[model samples]
Structure formats: C-alpha cells, structure tokens
Target: YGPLFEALAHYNDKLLAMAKAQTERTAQALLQTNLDPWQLIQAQMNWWQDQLKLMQHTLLKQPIYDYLKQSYLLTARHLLASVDALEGVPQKSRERLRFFTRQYVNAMAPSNFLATNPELLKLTLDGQNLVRGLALLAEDLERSADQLNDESAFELGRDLALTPGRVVQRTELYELIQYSPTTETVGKTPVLIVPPFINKYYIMDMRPQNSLVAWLVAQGQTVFMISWRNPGVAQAQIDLDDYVVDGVIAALDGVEAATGEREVHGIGYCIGGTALSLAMGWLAARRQKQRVRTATLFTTLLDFSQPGELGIFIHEPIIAALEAQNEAKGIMDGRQLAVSFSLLRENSLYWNYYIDSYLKGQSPVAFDLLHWNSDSTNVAGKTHNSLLRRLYLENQLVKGELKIRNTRIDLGKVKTPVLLVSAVDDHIALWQGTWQGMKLFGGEQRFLLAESGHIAGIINPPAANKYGFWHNGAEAESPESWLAGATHQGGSWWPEMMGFIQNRSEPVPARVPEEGLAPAPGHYVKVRLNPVF
Candidate 1:
C-alpha cells in the first residue's frame, strides 16, 4: 500500500505536469478567444484528478494491484511519449494521439470490472448482489450498447416533443410541420427551422417548457420544423444535392404553401444550417429569386478548417476506412457516430455508465436530453463521403468551390441577412471557424456567442435565463477582436434573435397549418435505426 501510494503520487504529478504543458503550449498557439486565462489549465487539472482517483482505486487493492495500475500508468506514459515523439510536428496528430490516450485510459479504469471496482465490491457483499448483477449482465451482454438513459421512460409526440402543431406537408425526405401559434397574432414572415439530419428535429422541441418550438410559438411566432428521415440502404444514392434540394428548398416550398407567404425566415441548427447555406448558395448561383429572408444559424460551420476536436478523425486513414465501411453499408450507421462522439468525453458519457449500469447492476435514470442523444440517425453513403471529404477535408464551402448538381455554390452570392450563433464551448463546430465562415457571406450579419455547448447553448429558453450570450453590433477582422468588442448580455439569445427576425417581419393574424396530415414531431422523426450489437 505504501509503494502503491508513492506510485500514485508519482503518476499524478507526472500526468499533471504533462497536461499543464500541453494546455499552455496548445493555448498559446491558438489563443485567440476572450476566455479566462486559467480556465484551460483548471479544467485539465480536474480531469487529471479523476485519473488520479482512478489509479488510487485500482492500486490500493494489493501489491498485485500496485503492478496492475503501474502497468496502466506505464502504458499511458508510453502513449503520452508517442505524442512527444512527434514534438508538436503536427497539431492534428498530437490531438489524435491525445484523444486515443484518453479513450484507452478511460476504458482501463478499475471501476469497470466486478473484481477490481471497490464501489461495486462493497455493494456486492450482499452475496445476492452478484447473482443480481450476473442476471443483469446477461441482459446487458445481450444488448451491448451504452445505456445512458431510461429508453422506456420517454416517447415521441407525448412526453418528449410536447409542442402542438400539424404536419402540413410530407415529402419522401422530410415532413414539414407548421406549429400552431399560442398567441392570437403571429409574425408576417413564418419561421422555418432546419434541424440537422444527424439527430431528430424534436431536440429543438424536447419538452413543453424546454421546447424551443413551444417557446417560439408562445412568443407570437409561427414556426415550422423539418423532420429528416433516418437513412438506411434504401437511401444509398442520396447525396449532398438531395439534402440541399429536397430538404431545405422543399421545406421552404412547403412553408410557403402552408402560410401562403412567399418570403420565409430560416433558422438552422448545426449541419441543418450547413444544408441551408448549401441551398442558399445554389439558389444564388441559379440567379433565382430568393425564397428565404433573414437566416439564423445555430452552431453551424461553413468553414471546416480548425474544426476543433472533430479534426482528429478527419484525416485520410480514418476517412478511407469509413469510405470502405460506407461502400459496404451504403450508409454510415448512427451508432458509429454515437461511439465517436462518446469518445470525445469518454469518462462521463462512456465510462461513468460503464461502471454504473454494468458493474453496479443499476438501471439508468430518465434523462430526456440523453435519451434524445441516444436516439441516433444515419447518413447516406454519398452524403457522408461528400461531407467528410469535401467540406471537412478540402474545405470547399468557404472557398466557393463546392458544386451541387454541376452548379458551383458561391457564398458571396448569398446577400440574405444572417445571424450567426455559436457556443463558446462547442468542440464539434468551432466558433472560430464559424466566425471565419461568416465572412464568406455577402450580407448584413451579426454574430452571437452564447455560453455552454453545442446543444445546451442553442436549446436554451428565454424563461430559463440560465445561460447568457455576447453580441457586438460592430465588425472585426478576427474572432478574437470581435469578442474583445462584444458586450456580454444576461439571459438567452432567443429574444435577440427574435428581435432580428421581428425587425424584418410584421405583426399579423396568427397563422395555423391545415389539418390534412399528422401531428407535430411527425413520422420522419419516429423513423429510427436499430444499431445491432
């Protein structure tokens, strides 16, 4: 135990030093944001504390335990050294190695196994607990996926998506639902929300109080949501063009048909905003009349250069393997994407549950956000390839080189007003890149930087008043400069965006969709994928 304690101190101090060095070096290189200088180091220290505790959990078991944890520490030392071997040669490789090391170390946690986990062992002295755990293990082994939420606790159209609306139009690709306005008078320009196909649209409408859709309706705005069908082998031939055309344009046409309003406002979330940008460029390239008025982008990036942590997986070797997978499957399964995302924060999203549900023989709690997160969707092979290769790899969107159906997409031609929204802690779509991409658009634009992450920041409601945002009416050359001049405002950015939308809109009699089709959070959102274990 003395030897183990000393070894624990050794690795903890050593790991902390390396992490501090890494943080300082990486931060200095890309230190453009107006963030707390000590924030990075502190966050990493907290993470390493978890690591220290994990090592302490394992090594205190026996002298054999000392050797066991030393094995992990030594292995981790080697992994860290591999990154040092490169010696900052390529930032991407360093990050890739860093990501891999974290995944490995998290998986090796002593708390994952029945014998090694002290907490589990303590609970299991009940003797009946092992049999109980064993019986549960059979079920867990039978369905081997990360059980992060109570899957049975939630359902669509009822508990989850409680917004009241009607599906006015349904296409093969999407169903356009125009939500019923809670106010007697709605805005003249109808709001059409283009959510990413990566997840269900109901993430925007997760619950009645938490629902962005419900919030929008109650604020006297007419909102329409696009629900993309979960893809499979049947959607093999679908490409970027199908997503841009059939999704954004068709939804726009549906909104116009429902409201008899030619001009509509656009609100896009994540890759949904990417699709909108693509279609807008196409519309501009065709020299056609613009159907969309003001556009609001939520955590979207047209420029993938420096796309935060996701850049680690964007290299050729990984893309080639995914290409091979796509060749066979005709679609990239949503579950694969889920695992990749879980790896981004392995300890919390992956390993915590690994110990809790599996080792502890405990069932997961009902979490609507996590439940929505676990409910995944697929992307067609062609769409996957083009997104990964063209946008991420080559970065064609900002360059105006991306062509859809032979017409080159040029963002410069898109003169429509845009409100660029980004999250401060969004690792998926880096706010810096989004700021850079906003420059490509030729129009009046205001950038909004919100607190929290990709989903939480965007899904925040006005009443919650939980997270605030920064806004600068002034323009700047770089994100760093923009942030410097930006004013930090309290409460949600929803009202600011609504102000943007309302300035371009007029008050009118509340508009409702015809009752010809299904309900809100319609059929397409319900189409799910079964990721077989």
Candidate 2:
C-alpha cells in the first residue's frame, strides 16, 4: 500500500504543478474565445501578432525571475499555433478539434483541482471550513445536484414566474397561460408567446421587473403564453409535428377561442420562433396565412446552414449517432444539455462556479434568470431527433422540405408581416445566420439588431432602461448592407414592437381568459426531469 500510494502521490503532484502553469499559458495564447468557432478564427489570427510583440519585450528586458513566466507564454503560443496549422483537415473538423482542445485545457486548469487550492490547504490549520465544503460536496453528489444560482432562494410561482395569469387552456403537450389585462383597453389583436420547449415559459415571465409578459400586459395587450410539458420516456415518438401542432397552433387556437378574435399576433423565442415560423408556413399552405396577423421572432434561426457555434456538432454522422443514442435512452438528458451550454460562456457560467463555490464558503448568487436557465427540461427523443435531422443537419425548413402533420412548410408562402430580431453578441443564433431568414420569408421584414446575447437581448426591459437596439427602415436585402445602414435606438424595443403590432390593428375592450385560477406557471414546469430519491 505504501509503495503504490507513495508513487501515485509523487508523480500526480509533480506534474500537476507544471500541468496548470503550462496549460493555462496555452489557453491564454489561444485568446480564450474558443466556444464560438467564428470568434476563434478572428482571435487566432490576432494572437500571433500580439504574441510576437509580447515575446521580444518580455524575453529580452525582463529579469531571470520573469524568464520563467515568459517561457510559459512562449510554450503556450507554439502549442496552439501548431494545433491551428495542422494541414489537410476540413475546416469544420478543425473547428471541432479546436473546441475539444480548449475544453480539455479548461478542464485541466490548476484551480479546478482541490489540491492546487491553498484555502483548503490549511491541512495544518483549523479544518472547520474545509470540512464543511467536503460534506456539502458529498450531499450535492448524493442528490445529483450542483446548485447554480441558489436554487433554494427562488420558487417558481412566487419568485420566478410571478406574472398574474390563469391556465385558460391546456393540452397533453402544453398549458396555455393567459395573463389578466393590466389596462382598461387592449389591442384588438392578442399576443401569443411560444417559448422554447427546452426551457420553461418562465424565462420570458420571470419577475415582473424584466418580464416580457408583464411588460406586454402593461402596454394594453391581451397576453398568452405556452408552458410546455417536460417530456418523459413515453414521449419518444413525439416529433416536430407534435410541438408545432399540439403546442404552438393549439395555443394559438386557445387564444382566439377565449378572446373571440381571429388574427392574433404571434411571437416566438429561440427554437420556439423556429416552430412559430413552421406553423406559419403550415397555415400558409392551408391558405389561412392571415391567422397570425404579424410575426415577431426573437433571435430565431430558420436557416441552419450556418447554425452558429453549435454547428460544430451538426455533421451528418455526429447527429445521427446522437439521435440513435437518444432513441435508446428515450429522452435527451436536460442537465447534461444545461452543462454543455453553460460552457459556451466557459468562464463566467461554468468555471467561475467551480472557483465560486468549492474554493470559497460564499453562498451561490441569487440570479432569477440563471435559476430559470438551470431549470432544464428533458426533450422527447423523436422531437430532439427531428430537430437534429430536419433542421440543424439537413437544413430542411429553409429548403421547404420540412413538414408538420401532412402540410409542407415554405416560409416564402407566408405573407404575414414579420419583425425579425437577432442579437449582436448571440453565440446560439448568431445575427449573421438569423439575418439570412429575413430573405427566406416572403413577408415584409423589419430586422432588429439587439444589444446583447440570446437571453438578455430578448428580456431587456424598458422600465430598467437597459440594452438598446438597431433598426434599418430600409431593411436591406443583405445583412452586411443592413448593418452598414442601420440606425441605433436607445431603450427597449418593446414599445417599438408594440407599435408595430398596434399600428396595423385596432383597439378593443380589455380581455382576460380567467382570473386567479392559480396556474400562471402551471404544473408542467415544476415537474423534475431528474428526480432524486
């Protein structure tokens, strides 16, 4: 025991020190923007020029003590440079390699391992705090929980989804929530919000301060939202048609039924917007194109040809393999999906938590949005596979080859006016990729370039007086020309968006589906996809 343990202890510590110093140096040389393949390209090109300048000054003028630090940077630079310059690799293959390379470097960093931390190194001092951390770690592992945003600090109905609404309608797939009207008069056209199935509807409805539902209600519009059910093992056969027909269109039908109004305004966020577009095309095929009077897409990706950074995983074989694995598993594990996305903001969301909790005794920060972000919803295997096969991999929706039920989707056939939004900093649906959708839809399009990433861009509130947007009245045929001619507008685009919807429609007596029936968030959102004993 002594001989084996001694040898293990000797080498693990011996190389671990160098592993951190050198691996971190390698990461720094790569310019640390690895999640987005496009950003990595720009970063790598600029790094060489910066590193050469850094090398001459530090290597020559610095003292011998500084020599060690400079050498670390020098070695780090060559490692990344060689990896980047490997020949005969397909660009997509290279990007995948680059992602895994940075992922490896990040995982191996010194501070991630407990042995490298001195706070816990009070191996000789008072062990109370260190012991507290170990016990908590054991409990978290026991429960399969990694608290991301003080989950205990927030509750769904009370703290998170506080918007006052009732479950006016529901189907097996989703609950349609209708917020009580805040004003005496409401727009003639009601607004139906289709939230992505991967997350709860609450992301848009979290806390009244930034809640889009709350803001829309205050603006004298009757508001309704779709709260999707968390899928189970039996959900394997539920495909895009299920989400589109049973989810979006069913909710749309509910809004009209409750309000006695036709041509309600349609809005979608993330993949929800993609579903809304598909439903619109289906409706268009049925020659009922005017049902959704105007469409508002929030950072939606209709064209998957260049599917942002996530396109790295969209190769035919990879998606097919994933689809089959999901088929056998019967559902996509939402927690793993949550962990993967947090890595996109590699430092702030993922590693910072490692540095935040285990290294210190501070309680997790109470962020409402992050609580919602961390609350993952398991996906039906067939639905997940359809999105992979039909949209992300085959680019079928934009190609007019995608279908919902027996109806084929052709965005060009939809004549409804559209307000297409894309975030400038969005890594999920890059503005450039979303911009391509403007041309795909034959409708009169108004493109909005919002000021932040996917979530923040859409949730920015006018009351908060934060985040702005850009608009080009010309709404150019090309994204490049659109950006070149676009004019920036301050404050939230909610009012502008409301104007876009209100101008085309008339006013009506305020409408409310039901009052205080107490399912504003509904039971589906609270269902735990991963339950612990």
Give the top-scoring candidate (lDDT).
1
- Model 1's number of clashes is 0
Error of 1 at 127 (Å): 50
lDDT of 1 by residue, 1-533 (tens): 45755754564465566657867987887866566722322333344455566667665646677657766675576556543456545665345334444434533454433224454444444443444553454344324344421123356877788788898888878888888878989778888889988877777887666688888888788898888889879898899899999878888888777888877889998898999888888898999898888999998889888767566556575567667778788998776565445312222333333222222223321134455665778889989999989999988887768899888988999999999999988768889999999988998888999887777677777866767999999999899999999999989999999889887635899986788589877877876665222
- The segments of candidate 1 whose C-alpha lies over 4 angstroms from its true place after superposition are 1-151, 343-366, 531-533
lDDT of 2 by residue, 26-135 (tens): 78978966676222333343444455556566756547656667667756875676565565567755654544444444434533323233333443233334445533
Model 1 has an lDDT value of: 0.73
**What lDDT would each prediction earn against the true structure?**
0.73, 0.71
